[PDB]
Amino acid sequence: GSVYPKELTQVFEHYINNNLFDIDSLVKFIEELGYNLEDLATLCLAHLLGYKKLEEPLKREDFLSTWFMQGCSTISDMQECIKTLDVKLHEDLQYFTQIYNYAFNLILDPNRKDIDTDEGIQYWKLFFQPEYPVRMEPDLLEAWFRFLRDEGKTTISKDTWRMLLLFFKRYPTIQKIISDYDETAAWPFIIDEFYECLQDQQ
């Protein structure tokens, strides 16, 4: 039929502001789930709930459909569902990648096509923590951030964002880039610039 479990509908109602599950709702929901906004697991949540844009409110039907399918009616249940996705974020490279690429689409401001470098950098700092499955030399990550700042790269395109994961797995160190990187491959042009910059600072 049509009625979701009362307990699930109470959860929705609890969070909404002036009839909408808005930005303030999602923040409170994350808080009550027991997370900080810095926690990558919050991206699994958004993805699980099918957010396309953070600016747009989450529809009731969408909120209810999603939890009904996870067998959740209570915060406790939802905590358990996210905890599980959080483990999968750390352990399953394919899932991490998907969530990584998804991050970009949410970071995008409305009406933009590239993300601002500062926002991008802030998110790269989250994704490249040693607990996560793509590990590289700290100096290399720092050199990348520094490059973007020093050379005036104020925006990051989807291609650059998506490709950087393969890049870092393929060359975990500055020296590996120096010794193996080929400019005539099909890397994003900004990655070619990064190589030249590193080549200079030898």
Binding site: I23, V27, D39, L54, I107
Partner: peptide, 12 residues
């Protein structure tokens, strides 16, 4: 969800 906090500051 850092973007979410940014959006809060913009709305406030």
């Amino acid at each position: 969800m850092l973007k979410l906090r940014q959006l809060q500051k913009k709305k406030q």
